[PDB]
Amino acid sequence: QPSTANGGFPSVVVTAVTATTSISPDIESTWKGLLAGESGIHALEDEFVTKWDLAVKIGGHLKDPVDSHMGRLDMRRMSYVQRMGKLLGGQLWESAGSPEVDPDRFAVVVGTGLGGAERIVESYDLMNAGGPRKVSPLAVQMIMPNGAAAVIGLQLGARAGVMTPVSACSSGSEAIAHAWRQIVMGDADVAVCGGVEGPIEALPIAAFSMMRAMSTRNDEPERASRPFDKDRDGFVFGEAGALMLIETEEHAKARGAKPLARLLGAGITSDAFHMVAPAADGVRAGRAMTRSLELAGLSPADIDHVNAHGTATPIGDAAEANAIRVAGCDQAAVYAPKSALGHSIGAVGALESVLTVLTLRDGVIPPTLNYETPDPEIDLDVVAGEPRYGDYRYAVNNSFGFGGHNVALAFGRY
Amino acid sequence: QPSTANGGFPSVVVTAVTATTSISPDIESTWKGLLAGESGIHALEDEFVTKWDLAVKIGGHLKDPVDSHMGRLDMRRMSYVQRMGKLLGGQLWESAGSPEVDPDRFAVVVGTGLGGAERIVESYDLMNAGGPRKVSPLAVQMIMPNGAAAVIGLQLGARAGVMTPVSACSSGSEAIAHAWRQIVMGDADVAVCGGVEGPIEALPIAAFSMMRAMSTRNDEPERASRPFDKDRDGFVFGEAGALMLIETEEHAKARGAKPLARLLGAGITSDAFHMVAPAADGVRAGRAMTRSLELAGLSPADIDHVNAHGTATPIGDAAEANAIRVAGCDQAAVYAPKSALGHSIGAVGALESVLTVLTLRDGVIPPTLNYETPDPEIDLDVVAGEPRYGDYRYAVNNSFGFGGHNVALAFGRY
Numbered sequence: 057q058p059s060t061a062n063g064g065f066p067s068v069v070v071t072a073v074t075a076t077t078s079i080s081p082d083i084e085s086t087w088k089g090l091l092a093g094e095s096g097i098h099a100l101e102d103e104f105v106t107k108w109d110l111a112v113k114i115g116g117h118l119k120d121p122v123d124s125h126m127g128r129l130d131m132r133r134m135s136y137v138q139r140m141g142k143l144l145g146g147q148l149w150e151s152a153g154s155p156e157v158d159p160d161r162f163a164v165v166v167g168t169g170l171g172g173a174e175r176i177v178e179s180y181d182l183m184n185a186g187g188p189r190k191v192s193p194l195a196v197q198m199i200m201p202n203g204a205a206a207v208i209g210l211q212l213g214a215r216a217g218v219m220t221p222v223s224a225c226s227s228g229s230e231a232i233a234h235a236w237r238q239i240v241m242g243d244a245d246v247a248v249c250g251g252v253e254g255p256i257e258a259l260p261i262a263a264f265s266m267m268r269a270m271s272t273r274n275d276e277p278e279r280a281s282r283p284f285d286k287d288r289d290g291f292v293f294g295e296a297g298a299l300m301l302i303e304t305e306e307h308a309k310a311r312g313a314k315p316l317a318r319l320l321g322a323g324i325t326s327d328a329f330h331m332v333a334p335a336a337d338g339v340r341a342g343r344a345m346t347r348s349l350e351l352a353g354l355s356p357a358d359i360d361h362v363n364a365h366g367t368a369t370p371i372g373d374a375a376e377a378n379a380i381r382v383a384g385c386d387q388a389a390v391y392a393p394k395s396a397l398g399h400s401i402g403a404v405g406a407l408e409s410v411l412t413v414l415t416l417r418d419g420v421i422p423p424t425l426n427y428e429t430p431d432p433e434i435d436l437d438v439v440a441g442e443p444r445y446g447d448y449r450y451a452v453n454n455s456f457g458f459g460g461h462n463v464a465l466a467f468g469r470y
Numbered sequence: 471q472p473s474t475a476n477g478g479f480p481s482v483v484v485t486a487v488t489a490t491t492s493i494s495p496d497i498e499s500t501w502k503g504l505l506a507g508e509s510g511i512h513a514l515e516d517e518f519v520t521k522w523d524l525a526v527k528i529g530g531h532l533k534d535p536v537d538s539h540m541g542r543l544d545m546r547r548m549s550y551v552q553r554m555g556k557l558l559g560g561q562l563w564e565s566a567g568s569p570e571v572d573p574d575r576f577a578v579v580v581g582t583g584l585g586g587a588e589r590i591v592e593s594y595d596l597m598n599a600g601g602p603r604k605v606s607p608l609a610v611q612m613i614m615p616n617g618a619a620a621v622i623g624l625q626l627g628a629r630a631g632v633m634t635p636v637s638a639c640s641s642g643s644e645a646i647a648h649a650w651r652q653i654v655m656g657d658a659d660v661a662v663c664g665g666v667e668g669p670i671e672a673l674p675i676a677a678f679s680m681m682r683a684m685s686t687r688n689d690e691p692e693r694a695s696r697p698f699d700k701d702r703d704g705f706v707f708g709e710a711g712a713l714m715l716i717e718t719e720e721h722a723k724a725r726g727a728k729p730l731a732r733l734l735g736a737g738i739t740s741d742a743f744h745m746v747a748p749a750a751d752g753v754r755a756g757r758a759m760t761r762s763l764e765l766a767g768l769s770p771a772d773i774d775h776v777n778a779h780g781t782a783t784p785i786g787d788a789a790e791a792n793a794i795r796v797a798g799c800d801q802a803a804v805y806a807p808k809s810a811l812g813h814s815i816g817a818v819g820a821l822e823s824v825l826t827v828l829t830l831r832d833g834v835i836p837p838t839l840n841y842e843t844p845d846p847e848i849d850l851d852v853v854a855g856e857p858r859y860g861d862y863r864y865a866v867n868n869s870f871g872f873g874g875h876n877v878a879l880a881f882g883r884y
């Protein structure tokens with residue numbers, strides 16, 4: 057039975073990371089800010105908040121808006137998530153040293169929650185106002201949810217597959233999972249993978265608010281996202297996109313790339329429980345963690361750190377606490393980055409995967425913000441107060457998305 | 471190096487199929503109609519054709535509309551593709567004998583091109599008319615493109631993963647590819663997989679028409695879709711959804727299920743060439759065919775039949791002819807079912823995969839409709855005139871989607 061530990065799978069390393077967040081457009085600055093206890097969450101200044109009198113008046117816009125980097129041409133030719141993908145793709149390749157790779161061994165896998173949806177409404181409006189010939193010949197390629205991955209694959213020249221998994225909050229982690237599979241099954245030697253997501257606007261707020269899924273602690277925005285805290289009251293939107301470069305250890309060594317961490321295994325399960333609520337017992341979500349360990353060749357006692365999904369909904373954090381216990385990982389040091397960065401849906405699993413890599417690289421876990429009165433019914437070792445420096449050898453990143461999609465990624469220190 | 475032929479991968483069989491098409495809601499009736507030379511393509515009767523004076527006035531609506539099976543509750547709770555998924559999921563399970571399987575070894579993988587997009591506009595309109603609290607608490611789960619797969623996973627109780635690949639025209643084949651991977655990597659023993667897609671309306675017609683991708687032969691609708699014909703002038707929409715049940719041969723034998731065919735291997739590559747045009751040289755698309763043979767353990771001389779992607783665009787059919795030659799499969803008997811069934815985007819690769827299974831089961835290939843003056847620059851062995859009965863041992867189904875996504879599925883006679 058093949059595993060990374062027993063050599064049945066090739067060794068796969070993470071060699072570059074990039075992200076744009078509510079704290080910073082630079083991932084190393086985001087990381088420094090997280091360690092300093094900074095939050096990206098603010099009072100929403102946009103006109104649409106007062107226009108609709110939204111119950112939610114907080115969130116984290118990108119520190120550096122994607123379109124401050126987009127000229128007239130890109131604003132014409134691409135949907136928002138495509139522009140974010142193009143921006144992150146070029147940043148990642150530069151960060152990797154702009155390597156010359158074999159396009160036929162190079163894959164792209166980028167998840168997203170929705171796609172180029174603003175272009176659906178625009179095309180609708182243009183046709184209503186001017187007839188069918190006022191729809192752009194570019195409408196299809198901007199609207200299609202595979203569009204961001206296709207843009208990145210075309211930009212970087214990836215000819216070993218361009219894939220787009222859609223699984224809501226787990227999309228960006230699932231993308232990394234499928235990129236790992238594409239390499240270990242022999243279809244590729246190198247892959248760009250992660251997730252992109254659109255911005256905060258009034259309709260997204262209304263849609264998730266009507267599930268009671270979002271915090272309404274508007275008077276103290278940086279205090280609103282409280283994963284595992286007794287007084288949590290839902291998640292906070294925090295915009296992001298994130299990509300990483302993974303490749304076989306042999307491929308990295310042959311080009312002089314220095315690994316930041318190892319990607320050891322990936323588990324994908326499903327709850328088949330409810331269309332938006334996670335299963336209370338945490339069993340299938342814990343099984344995704346277990347499966348990632350089976351493929352890595354690890355036991356639960358090896359897991360020093362869990363980067364929680366931790367959205368700060370009442371039911372979600374309780375389900376995840378059961379999942380971590382089910383997987384035998386409840387002695388691990390737990391971090392919930394949505395406490396500081398908010399929830400970026402289809403990007404967030406990729407962002408948190410990057411954070412897990414940086415935790416392993418630097419031997420430090422940032423504080424979970426707002427963890428002040430731990431929920432009495434949840435007993436996890438949540439890092440809080442200030443960063444915890446420790447000997448983290450292996451870690452699991454959790455993403456448990458709406459729809460019941462469970463993805464666990466097992467990483468190791470390089 | 472593992473292959474199906476050398477036992478490195480478990481044997482995987484197809485045990486049930488279901489589909490709704492422009493010819494019939496019953497896949498066996500669709501098959502009989504194809505063999506009889508029937509077309510699902512008709513003059514569009516809908517009011518929107520005259521309202522917009524669309525250049526395209528032809529297409530194939532489902533013979534039996536999905537919503538003639540949907541009551542008030544389903545019309546309230548689900549997007550269109552979710553309703554189609556629920557309908558096909560229940561039909562497939564009944565067709566399979568309603569087996570009791572282990573939910574923890576049971577996966578669902580259903581592709582789609584777009585998702586619950588009509589619910590985006592509706593939620594937009596409701597909020598414009600009544601404020602944020604007039605958005606349904608069900609809006610998120612109806613809109614999210616993973617919604618159809620989640621509905622099916624919840625309906626049938628699949629807890630070994632629920633996945634949604636998005637790759638335009640290749641989505642439904644890519645779903646079958648990923649379901650095969652989930653089984654051969656050991657994550658599941660049984661999987662429901664395929665693709666669903668929305669209906670023909672005015673905006674979809676306008677969007678694809680403005681690329682010049684669609685036929686405008688309105689005076690003879692059944693003659694308009696002409697894959698590989700000298701006088702082809704683009705594709706024709708033909709609505710569909712399709713699912714198949716795959717499982718390990720051992721799992722099928724243990725429950726008395728009779729296989730219809732074997733699923734032997736799957737290849738996924740990408741062009742990285744253009745956002746909507748396929749690469750003229752056909753090289754990466756041919757490589758997807760080759761990769762499916764490598765994983766199956768077949769050589770090109772084994773391939774008796776290719777179920778072409780064959781959309782009947784000028785550039786697409788020419789690129790595919792090069793791909794088939796690149797893969798060494800140009801002695802295979804070729805069928806282009808879009809000649810009769812039209813193009814159903816995210817469903818069509820799954821539909822054509824079902825047709826490939828039926829070709830192998832019954833030893834017959836239906837006639838490619840409208841193949842009357844073969845394009846002098848394309849030299850393939852296109853089945854035409856009447857069905858060709860032959861000794862088809864192995865076959866490849868091609869799907870080459872907008873964005874440059876190439877999926878080839880290798881099937882064998884059981």
Ligand SMILES: CCCCS(=O)(=O)Nc1ccc2cnn(C)c2c1
Binds near residue numbers: 170
């Ligand atoms: C962190 C915020 C996430 C908001 S969302 O989940 O509703 N995705 C999203 C995706 C695409 C677009 C286009 N415009 N808009 C507004 C979009 C929004």
Ligand SMILES: CCCCS(=O)(=O)Nc1ccc2cnn(C)c2c1
Binds near residue numbers: 168169263593610
């Ligand atoms: C521009 C239109 C925004 C559509 S929305 O306001 O309803 N938000 C939204 C809804 C569902 C999903 C699933 N994934 N993701 C990211 C989603 C986002």
Ligand SMILES: CCCCS(=O)(=O)Nc1ccc2cnn(C)c2c1
Binds near residue numbers: 551815
């Ligand atoms: C065979 C026709 C395919 C049309 S399409 O590619 O534009 N998919 C599509 C998907 C969802 C919806 C919801 N409403 N509508 C109209 C939809 C259409």
Ligand SMILES: CCCCS(=O)(=O)Nc1ccc2cnn(C)c2c1
Binds near residue numbers: 582675
């Ligand atoms: C209800 C809104 C329809 C949006 S549309 O008219 O522009 N058609 C459309 C456009 C792009 C894609 C990609 N996959 N698929 C299926 C697509 C379909």
Ligand code: NA
Binds near residue numbers: 363366408409
């Ligand atoms: Na996490």
Ligand code: NA
Binds near residue numbers: 778779780822867868
């Ligand atoms: Na085909």
